Subunit: 93 residues, 4 copies
């Protein structure tokens, strides 16, 4: 539970970081910068807001390598430590 909370906070900070970076360097609206950060770190990669600057491209490379680990860690704990038990409880006859 404390584990999920740390991961939750780490994910938030990471996304705020991306939001600030892309709005500044790539000139994205903050909402689009947040959207892009999430779509990037979850490896979805629609591509609509991909970086046009070299600074943006270099940050994105580093952001992916550092961010993917904690975003999927959070997703994994959410799925295993939260969603799993809930669905089960909704089964209990």
């Amino acid at each position: 539970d404390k584990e999920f909370q740390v991961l939750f906070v780490l994910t938030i900070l990471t996304l705020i970081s991306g939001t600030i970076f892309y709005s500044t360097v790539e000139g994205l609206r903050p909402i689009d910068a947040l959207f892009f950060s999430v779509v990037t770190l979850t490896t979805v990669g629609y591509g609509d807001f991909s970086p046009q600057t070299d600074f943006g491209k270099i940050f994105t490379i580093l952001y992916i390598f550092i961010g993917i680990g904690l975003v999927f860690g959070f997703i994994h704990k959410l799925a295993v430590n939260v969603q799993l038990p809930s669905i089960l409880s909704n089964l209990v006859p």
Copy 2:
């Protein structure tokens, strides 16, 4: 077997949810909304039907975080608990 069935039903409900959301908010044809939901939760992300509204972008963020866990759980069980044994049976000399 009951596990695969629950996951199958959970995946269906999740996809119906996306289908309804994107057809409503993003104005997609239902088939395109379903297609987009799948392409999103499997992390493929072609990008053709990416959300243009802020409401769409925010939902997509939440949808990804909540949906990826159960979609890949289903894929994983399908692969391990279903495809694996079948291919093996097709080997049995």
Copy 3:
């Protein structure tokens, strides 16, 4: 070793299936159809050759769910049962 071989053959058949489907239904050159099949099942999803027909979209949904399991199984075995040992052997002082 026999495991890697089965997975290798299963991956090939799956890709041939996609190649045939997309060249037929989506009118892709065979090379582009193969490329699209791989880019889809590995979840990269550049998006250049995404399906424009409903038949194409529906197949793609099913193809993703059935194909991702065996493509990543193959990738995983390749990495663990093949690449891992080789790199190690190149270390042995």
Copy 4:
């Protein structure tokens, strides 16, 4: 630690390989070729720099299958063997 170092070097070599290939065959600026290599092997796949030549498409197929294993291995070790302990240390009361 030696494991992380090998993976770090293997990831670098792999990315240099992609960088050289795409700048040569697809005529990308080196920075864009590196960016594309990373976006490919991490399965993000924005799609802006996708290959237009058959040679590019064929290499990309092989590059994905061979590269994804080591890139995610590196990401996994980075997350487990490096990020995990650090965040923990920042907790120690």
